Ligand binder design. Structure first.
Ligand SMILES: *[C@@H]1O[C@H](CO)[C@@H](O[C@@H]2O[C@H](CO)[C@@H](O[C@@H]3O[C@H](CO[C@H]4O[C@H](CO)[C@@H](O)[C@H](O[C@H]5O[C@H](CO)[C@@H](O)[C@H](O)[C@@H]5O[C@H]5O[C@H](CO)[C@@H](O)[C@H](O)[C@@H]5O)[C@@H]4O)[C@@H](O)[C@H](O[C@H]4O[C@H](CO)[C@@H](O)[C@H](O)[C@@H]4O)[C@@H]3O)[C@H](O)[C@H]2NC(C)=O)[C@H](O)[C@H]1NC(C)=O
Ligand SMILES: *[C@@H]1O[C@H](CO)[C@@H](O[C@@H]2O[C@H](CO)[C@@H](O[C@@H]3O[C@H](CO[C@H]4O[C@H](CO)[C@@H](O)[C@H](O[C@H]5O[C@H](CO)[C@@H](O)[C@H](O)[C@@H]5O[C@H]5O[C@H](CO)[C@@H](O)[C@H](O)[C@@H]5O)[C@@H]4O)[C@@H](O)[C@H](O[C@H]4O[C@H](CO)[C@@H](O)[C@H](O)[C@@H]4O)[C@@H]3O)[C@H](O)[C@H]2NC(C)=O)[C@H](O)[C@H]1NC(C)=O
Ligand SMILES: *[C@@H]1O[C@H](CO)[C@@H](O[C@@H]2O[C@H](CO)[C@@H](O[C@@H]3O[C@H](CO)[C@@H](O)[C@H](O)[C@@H]3O)[C@H](O)[C@H]2NC(C)=O)[C@H](O)[C@H]1NC(C)=O
Ligand SMILES: *[C@@H]1O[C@H](CO)[C@@H](O[C@@H]2O[C@H](CO)[C@@H](O[C@@H]3O[C@H](CO)[C@@H](O)[C@H](O)[C@@H]3O)[C@H](O)[C@H]2NC(C)=O)[C@H](O)[C@H]1NC(C)=O
Ligand SMILES: *[C@@H]1O[C@H](CO)[C@@H](O[C@@H]2O[C@H](CO)[C@@H](O[C@@H]3O[C@H](CO)[C@@H](O)[C@H](O)[C@@H]3O)[C@H](O)[C@H]2NC(C)=O)[C@H](O)[C@H]1NC(C)=O
Ligand SMILES: *[C@@H]1O[C@H](CO)[C@@H](O[C@@H]2O[C@H](CO)[C@@H](O[C@@H]3O[C@H](CO)[C@@H](O)[C@H](O)[C@@H]3O)[C@H](O)[C@H]2NC(C)=O)[C@H](O)[C@H]1NC(C)=O
Ligand SMILES: *[C@@H]1O[C@H](CO)[C@@H](O[C@@H]2O[C@H](CO)[C@@H](O[C@@H]3O[C@H](CO)[C@@H](O)[C@H](O)[C@@H]3O)[C@H](O)[C@H]2NC(C)=O)[C@H](O)[C@H]1NC(C)=O
Ligand SMILES: *[C@@H]1O[C@H](CO)[C@@H](O[C@@H]2O[C@H](CO)[C@@H](O[C@@H]3O[C@H](CO)[C@@H](O)[C@H](O)[C@@H]3O)[C@H](O)[C@H]2NC(C)=O)[C@H](O)[C@H]1NC(C)=O
Ligand SMILES: *[C@@H]1O[C@H](CO)[C@@H](O[C@@H]2O[C@H](CO)[C@@H](O)[C@H](O)[C@H]2NC(C)=O)[C@H](O)[C@H]1NC(C)=O
Ligand SMILES: *[C@@H]1O[C@H](CO)[C@@H](O[C@@H]2O[C@H](CO)[C@@H](O)[C@H](O)[C@H]2NC(C)=O)[C@H](O)[C@H]1NC(C)=O
Ligand SMILES: *[C@@H]1O[C@H](CO)[C@@H](O[C@@H]2O[C@H](CO)[C@@H](O)[C@H](O)[C@H]2NC(C)=O)[C@H](O)[C@H]1NC(C)=O
Ligand SMILES: *[C@@H]1O[C@H](CO)[C@@H](O[C@@H]2O[C@H](CO)[C@@H](O)[C@H](O)[C@H]2NC(C)=O)[C@H](O)[C@H]1NC(C)=O
Ligand SMILES: *[C@@H]1O[C@H](CO)[C@@H](O[C@@H]2O[C@H](CO)[C@@H](O)[C@H](O)[C@H]2NC(C)=O)[C@H](O)[C@H]1NC(C)=O
Ligand SMILES: *[C@@H]1O[C@H](CO)[C@@H](O[C@@H]2O[C@H](CO)[C@@H](O)[C@H](O)[C@H]2NC(C)=O)[C@H](O)[C@H]1NC(C)=O
Ligand SMILES: *[C@@H]1O[C@H](CO)[C@@H](O)[C@H](O)[C@H]1NC(C)=O
Ligand SMILES: *[C@@H]1O[C@H](CO)[C@@H](O)[C@H](O)[C@H]1NC(C)=O
Ligand SMILES: *[C@@H]1O[C@H](CO)[C@@H](O)[C@H](O)[C@H]1NC(C)=O
Ligand SMILES: *[C@@H]1O[C@H](CO)[C@@H](O)[C@H](O)[C@H]1NC(C)=O
Ligand SMILES: *[C@@H]1O[C@H](CO)[C@@H](O)[C@H](O)[C@H]1NC(C)=O
Lengths: 122, 449, 77, 449, 122, 122
């Protein structure tokens, strides 16, 4: 569980299976943990929604029909899976996450599933 | 390179959520209806479920923390709760024909307790009820005649009587978080409360914690380990109270040494009052005893552990308080239900340089609190027959630095406190709430169909 | 809003007196109070402070026992 | 043709759900503990987020609406809330040796206020408390002797005293819906409340709305735009009150023009009473002033805007009320905490045909309400020292049509009201709740594998 | 967002991406908006369930192995994507939605996934 | 609905469509049925999660790349679909459910989707 976030990305890639395990794992003062469990569920579902509206939905890992952007911190192939970590990446990435999402959720499946319709007919 | 996302990634950030308790199982069985206040608190994971973390360091801030204030709002909430259905006391703000004592108990216990007599509502509405009871000096006040007094609260704040079935025993509570939220757990022993902590685990069900209630003195708390620890948000700020944690348990034995008797006064229906009766045999003041030389050596290792900040040679001195309310001017606390205030004056008249019986300091008992400045309501601490004795460990302290404007000449300390939240920070020093996001995307030369 | 200092006053060598700071516009209990003094053409001086919670204070070494600063929570003063 | 469904389609229908407020940010900071009642109300979307709609028309019904009654149950709920912990008043239903006044203030303010004197509970239980206070004539009542009176409520309904920390300032509230639910927002300016509205937007966080509290007169409300608007569920039904909205703001200045003094009576513990003291200097009645000719021209544009329904030439006439409780027979309202009832008699003695100082109508103050017929509890409106002045805009009115059974001969109006819900409908006229379903399926020649 | 429900069906088809965007978008009197968010979640999930039990589940658009019914308002191909709107359709459709559902949820995947098993074996 | 749990497994297999129908089917004392509906939703979602993290997710039925274990009560092919029922099975199965789950959720898709990546690249 979250075993070694300080291990590099290529090492950490081996299992993505326990952080997704205990992430659900099965009166006033009694109202509260209800109010907490409910948004834990909402966060899980916001996730699964942002996921399904991407070509992903297929759990955990998912290749995608959009590449990279130079300016988005031009770096190298061995410099990150072998020399970096996760937050280490997303703190940098904080500055561009939004339009990343925006282009996935639009320019992908919407085009992709409409093109699919254009062949799911013949 | 294309893009590809990952669900379950190791990334989180600074967030604070609502959290829930956990009170294990062997506490659950003791028959007699309700306990502390954990009514629906769910038992503890019977195994230590923690994960050490490899090559990760991030920054704990014990004052920028939150779960301390979570537990604070929680405990004043359940404070309100605890007594909410308990017995009212509105027919006590009544005139009080009183007097002192009649027994050979020295001026050491002269009067102080009072033998007041007065009328009262009966079970019914008509009849009055000539009665009498005994009270600590600090529950009463003169009014300009023989000896008619008032209770301290009756010009400020109504008062309810705690249900006697309640017991004031702090019980280890495991605060446990929801998912998506983790608790980073610092695991070095040298973390002055602020900054990044390398040695860390991840945890959800924090250890069993007793919310000990005391001023100046910190009781039954957690140990430090090798080199006793001290923490301040910025001690150069003298006004920032200093909180210290011991690696060494201080033996303390407190005793209210008189055999009391209880009166189920009938101010009925239903609502029954509980008064003091006359006392069995001799009368002696509550107090506490502590091992002299262990005290000596702990304050040694302390004064060793401070001049690091204030030059290996500086003039140290301690003293009795700077004058506060009885809660802060003395070691206020509870033992066995009733409430002590200990004259901690005796343990600080000292001056420290560079590198036999046992101590008996007395405490006086009070029954009328309205704690956390939560006035508008007071609690009557009901009596307990027999005597009271109290084993405790002392593990930390709250202190105040004098601002002797020099350069680093003489600096002197006293037992601080007042703000109760520190007794929580003093076991919250080691935790941080983090919101994890299982999502993380990376470029890579991978195509879809 | 602000604060209410009592007006100026004369007394006598030896003796003793009491001075009032009335607080309006917020939380008397939260926050903390300090006192300060400027003598005849003089660099100002610190006097002392009180947290209005429990009541804890700290009198600087040269003014301990000299001064006695207090609060009343109900009057918010 | 096969079938194929679509998620996100533009289809909804007539439904009504639970909704939540929104109270923006700059309201959040004003230190001093609690506000209006929005304790957990979440701030406003700082950008106007709305979507105009193309070639859509559907039917708003301002009376078949719901969020009006939502806000009504909400506000009586928080009414109950507001005072729930505030100070009780049970020791006031007591005999009252009274009298009138002693100052040169004319029969225009003769007596009316009363100088009652009576005993009272002390902080304690024993002692009584001979005291005295000043009251508006409508808070008291004779009983068959010198001058002993009763409070109006003491034969009907207990009374609590509002916590003084409460303030009676309506604050713009943004009612905001959940998803799956949308608010259709009518955007023409000529929508007599009923029927389909072509010019529409879709919205979720409705504008900031102050829940102004008044009878007959509508205060600080929303404007109409070009041609002032009028609405009735079916005005031919005279009994259907008529609600009107102005395109023109009416200046109104109200004033309670006496410098009061407050008494923190001590009926302790805790519970402190707040009485009227003697008044500073002269005494004059509260009242209000309004710009004469603006009044003239607004009632012009109105009487122009009505004969459309009642023939371009009909006999119009206005009058003072048909006799109701003080709430409906006068302009009842609050300003600056205390509660006015204005003799709106003066602004209607008029008759209208076809196509200089300023008006001073007086109001009398009352402190004892039990509003929304919610008897069983009354509220003591506590005093305010100093004087009170009140800037307000008047933007609408509640009226009653006389049923002069003729054909269309003479029709005459008076300020109606009573049912408070209209002051909400009068800003709810422009919204409808719709439940969207993102699903919609269509046939089409498409095959799966 | 719900931009122009009055634009015809073929025009409206272009994006089905924002109505599914803000549809989640991330003490008494405090109990209520909890009671509201919860059934918003239930409505979303009732949807996703009715969706997955159909061959669809694949978000937004989904072709299906059942055709049309004459009587169900015989009309034309250009009369609806070019001349009609959404509610405009479903108000008509109100009279037949139920057995539509019934036949999808049964006669489809149940047959379809069992036949699939009959080939997911060899 | 749960029609004949006493009918054998091969008979019962015909429809698995109504037990999944009414399983959602669309003040104190008022707090309670809220507290009940919420965990009904959580149970449904715990299900769908345990489902998606398996190669399944595809509703109802789902073949899998792990076989049998001898010791796990060696029996026969006609002895169970023609002679047994559901609880009848799971009461036996109570003794091994855990590592069954454990091996599915790990040794399957994690390997399977990583191998897929190893071909979803070329
Ligand atoms: C915190 O710290 C304070 C301060 O130290 C403690 O206060 C002490 O409290 C205790 C009890 O509360 C007091 O004890 C009493 O002592 C008196 C006087 O005894 C003296 O004189 C006789 C001769 O006249 C000596 O023989 C006594 O020697 C005693 O101690 C020595 C060791 O030092 C021991 O070897 C002796 O035998 C003797 O002990 C007892 O011996 C036998 C059994 O061994 C026993 O039968 C006998 O009674 C002796 O007690 C000593 O120098 C003594 O008279 C008292 O007893 C009587 O009266 C009480 C009251 O009615 C009865 O209950 C009891 O049964 C006897 O009838 C007490 O024992 C002590 O004086 C006092 N002060 C000091 C300085 O110790 C607190 O108790 C501490 N509290 C906590 C919580 O830590
Ligand atoms: C709602 O509507 C009602 C009805 O109109 C208003 O009631 C009015 O209320 C005001 C104040 O509340 C009253 O004002 C007082 O007026 C008296 C009488 O003044 C007359 O006589 C003198 C000579 O004897 C004239 O010079 C006065 O002329 C005043 O007005 C003219 C313009 O019309 C102006 O040019 C003059 O200078 C003079 O104004 C003032 O001049 C100087 C400064 O410019 C000032 O020092 C002086 O005192 C004048 O007030 C007028 O014809 C006057 O005596 C009063 O003043 C004194 O007594 C009070 C009480 O102690 C003191 O507070 C004050 O300081 C003075 O000592 C008042 O000014 C007015 O009469 C009354 N009625 C009318 C019809 O106006 C409400 O106020 C309105 N309320 C709201 C909320 O809208
Ligand atoms: C505390 O004060 C109360 C006063 O209400 C004391 O109770 C009363 O005490 C007096 C003596 O102080 C008792 O008087 C004697 O009573 C006995 C028995 O009735 C009688 O034989 C004598 O002739 C004399 O009258 C009185 O009865 C007693 N009453 C009650 C109801 O208790 C109490 O003793 C005081 N306690 C202490 C510890 O000081
Ligand atoms: C710190 O921990 C010590 C160690 O337990 C606590 O001492 C305990 O004191 C309580 C009373 O405050 C004792 O409770 C009572 O115990 C007696 C007999 O054991 C029983 O008759 C009563 O019904 C009640 O349960 C408790 O026993 C005692 N601990 C032990 C092991 O005996 C101390 O209270 C703690 N600190 C604080 C501030 O409470
Ligand atoms: C802290 O320590 C200081 C000194 O170490 C204590 O100061 C003393 O204050 C008391 C009370 O203000 C003075 O007491 C007076 O004593 C006479 C004769 O015994 C008595 O009859 C009076 O009623 C009065 O209490 C005392 O003179 C003064 N100085 C000393 C050397 O004791 C102070 O009380 C301590 N405060 C705390 C909170 O520990
Ligand atoms: C409202 O009625 C109360 C009665 O409770 C008035 O209070 C009392 O008023 C009388 C005069 O009406 C005061 O009498 C005089 O008092 C002064 C000072 O004590 C003394 O020099 C005179 O010889 C005479 O006795 C009386 O003291 C006063 N008492 C109190 C407690 O206020 C009050 O003035 C009335 N207020 C108004 C606005 O009418
Ligand atoms: C309709 O809107 C007007 C415009 O604000 C409201 O007038 C306002 O009246 C309130 C009292 O009812 C004033 O509040 C007080 O203001 C003074 C000084 O501003 C301050 O000392 C008090 O603590 C309190 O905040 C308010 O200031 C005043 N508006 C302005 C701009 O000054 C009117 O109350 C509204 N209508 C109704 C029926 O309330
Ligand atoms: C509405 O307007 C009508 C007339 O325009 C008012 O009618 C009047 O009612 C009052 C009270 O019932 C009558 O008053 C009497 O006047 C004498 C002498 O001034 C007085 O001493 C009595 O105590 C009594 O109040 C009055 O004669 C009667 N007619 C007129 C022409 O005034 C009515 O009061 C108004 N009501 C409202 C709610 O505006
Ligand atoms: C309890 O009530 C009795 C009456 O039953 C009080 O006795 C009276 O006290 C007053 C003092 O003001 C005297 O004037 C009466 O003469 C007493 N006797 C009576 C009324 O019979 C007694 O003082 C009360 N004790 C309290 C209140 O502590
Ligand atoms: C405190 O006083 C009470 C009442 O006198 C004592 O209670 C008695 O204790 C003795 C000895 O334990 C018993 O034999 C009696 O039966 C008890 N009676 C009652 C009514 O309780 C008590 O023991 C005293 N405290 C101590 C420590 O002995
Ligand atoms: C506090 O109480 C404990 C227990 O009553 C004391 O510890 C005992 O100390 C004596 C000698 O002082 C030993 O003979 C016992 O074996 C100890 N027992 C236990 C359980 O600790 C301790 O000394 C007391 N300290 C003070 C300052 O009173
Ligand atoms: C307030 O209480 C006093 C008593 O302290 C009342 O004065 C008594 O009034 C009654 C009237 O019925 C007379 O019979 C008594 O002689 C009065 N004097 C006493 C009892 O000493 C006074 O009337 C009360 N005022 C109220 C209730 O308004
Ligand atoms: C209403 O009366 C009060 C009490 O007399 C006035 O308060 C005083 O106001 C003056 C002038 O503003 C100050 O100099 C005093 O210090 C105030 N004293 C107190 C105790 O408040 C008040 O000003 C009067 N109202 C107005 C509008 O002046
Ligand atoms: C109501 O009050 C406002 C403000 O006090 C009055 O408006 C002022 O009117 C005077 C002349 O009447 C002008 O000189 C001021 O410049 C105006 N100021 C503001 C802020 O409006 C208004 O006239 C009053 N109306 C009545 C009927 O009393
Ligand atoms: C990539 O980022 C750069 C910023 O330097 C921007 O100019 C470019 O348009 C981005 N790529 C795309 C496809 O928008
Ligand atoms: C990154 O790769 C480029 C070639 O694409 C190489 O020239 C450069 O030295 C590399 N630098 C690092 C830090 O990997
Ligand atoms: C289509 O609807 C008609 C109604 O006229 C009905 O007779 C027919 O059975 C329906 N089609 C099927 C396949 O049931
Ligand atoms: C519909 O199409 C038919 C041919 O299938 C044609 O005869 C008819 O005129 C068309 N009518 C409309 C309204 O589209
Ligand atoms: C199957 O169960 C048996 C128990 O007899 C065990 O020895 C064996 O290892 C299990 N199979 C696998 C693949 O672990």
């Amino acid at each position: 569980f979250l075993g070694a976030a300080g291990s590099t990305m290529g090492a950490a890639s081996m299992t993505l299976t326990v952080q997704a395990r205990n992430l659900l794992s099965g009166t006033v003062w009694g109202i509260k943990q209800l109010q907490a469990r409910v948004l834990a569920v909402e966060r899980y579902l916001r996730d699964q929604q942002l996921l399904g509206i991407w070509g992903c939905s297929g759990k955990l890992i998912c290749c995608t029909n959009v590449p990279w952007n130079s300016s988005w911190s031009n770096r190298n192939l061995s410099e990150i899976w072998d020399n970096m970590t996760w937050l280490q990446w997303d703190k940098e990435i904080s500055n561009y996450t939004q339009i990343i999402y925006g282009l996935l959720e639009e320019s992908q499946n919407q085009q992709e599933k409409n093109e699919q319709d254009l062949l799911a007919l013949d | 390179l294309w893009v590809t996302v990952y669900y379950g990634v190791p990334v989180w950030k600074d967030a604070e959520t609502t959290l829930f308790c956990a009170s294990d199982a062997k506490a659950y069985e003791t028959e007699k209806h309700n306990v502390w206040a954990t009514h629906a608190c769910v038992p503890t994971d019977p195994n230590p479920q923690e994960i050490h973390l490899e090559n990760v360091t991030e920054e704990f801030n014990m004052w920028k923390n939150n779960m301390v204030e979570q537990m604070h709002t929680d405990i004043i909430s359940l404070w309100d709760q605890s007594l909410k259905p308990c017995v009212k006391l509105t027919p006590l703000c009544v005139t009080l024909q009183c007097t002192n004592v009649t027994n050979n108990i020295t001026d050491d216990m002269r009067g102080e307790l009072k033998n007041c007599s007065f009328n009262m509502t009966t079970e019914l509405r008509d009849k009055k009820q000539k009665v009498y009871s005994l009270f600590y000096r600090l529950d009463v006040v003169q009014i300009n005649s023989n000896k008619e007094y008032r209770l301290i609260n009756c010009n400020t704040s109504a008062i309810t009587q705690a249900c006697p079935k309640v017991s004031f025993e702090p019980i280890p509570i495991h605060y446990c978080a929801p998912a998506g939220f983790a608790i980073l757990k610092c695991k070095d022993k040298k973390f002055n409360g602020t900054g990044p902590c390398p040695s860390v685990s991840t945890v959800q069900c924090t250890h069993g914690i007793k919310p000990v209630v005391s001023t100046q003195l910190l009781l039954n708390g957690s140990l430090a380990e090798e080199e006793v620890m001290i923490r301040s948000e910025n001690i150069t700020n003298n006004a920032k109270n200093i909180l210290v944690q011991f690696n060494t348990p201080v033996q303390i034995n407190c005793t209210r040494p008189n055999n009391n008797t209880r009166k189920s006064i009938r101010i009925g229906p239903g609502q029954a009052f509980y008064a003091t009766g006359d006392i069995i045999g001799d009368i002696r003041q509550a107090h506490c005893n502590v091992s002299k030389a262990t005290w000596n050596e702990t304050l040694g290792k302390v004064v060793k552990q401070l001049r690091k900040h204030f030059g290996n040679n500086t003039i140290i001195r301690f003293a009795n308080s700077s004058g506060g309310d009885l809660e802060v001017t003395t070691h206020s606390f509870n033992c066995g239900g009733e409430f002590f205030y200990c004259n901690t004056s005796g343990l600080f008249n000292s001056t420290w340089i560079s590198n036999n019986d046992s101590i008996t300091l007395p405490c006086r008992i009070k029954q009328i609190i309205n704690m956390w400045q939560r006035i508008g309501q007071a609690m009557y601490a009901p009596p307990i027959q027999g005597v009271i004795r109290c084993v405790s460990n002392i593990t930390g302290l709250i202190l105040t630095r004098d601002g002797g404007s020099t350069n680093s000449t003489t600096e002197t300390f006293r037992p601080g406190g007042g703000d109760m939240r520190d007794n929580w920070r003093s076991e919250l020093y080691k935790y941080k709430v983090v919101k994890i996001e299982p999502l993380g995307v990376a470029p890579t030369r991978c195509k879809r169909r | 809003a602000g604060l209410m200092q009592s007006g100026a006053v004369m007394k006598n060598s030896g003796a003793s007196v009491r001075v009032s700071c009335q607080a309006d516009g917020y939380d008397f209990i939260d926050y903390v109070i300090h006192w300060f003094r400027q003598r005849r053409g003089e660099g100002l001086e610190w006097l002392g402070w009180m947290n209005p919670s429990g009541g804890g204070t700290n009198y600087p070494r040269p003014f301990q026992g000299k001064v006695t600063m207090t609060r009343d929570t109900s009057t918010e003063t």
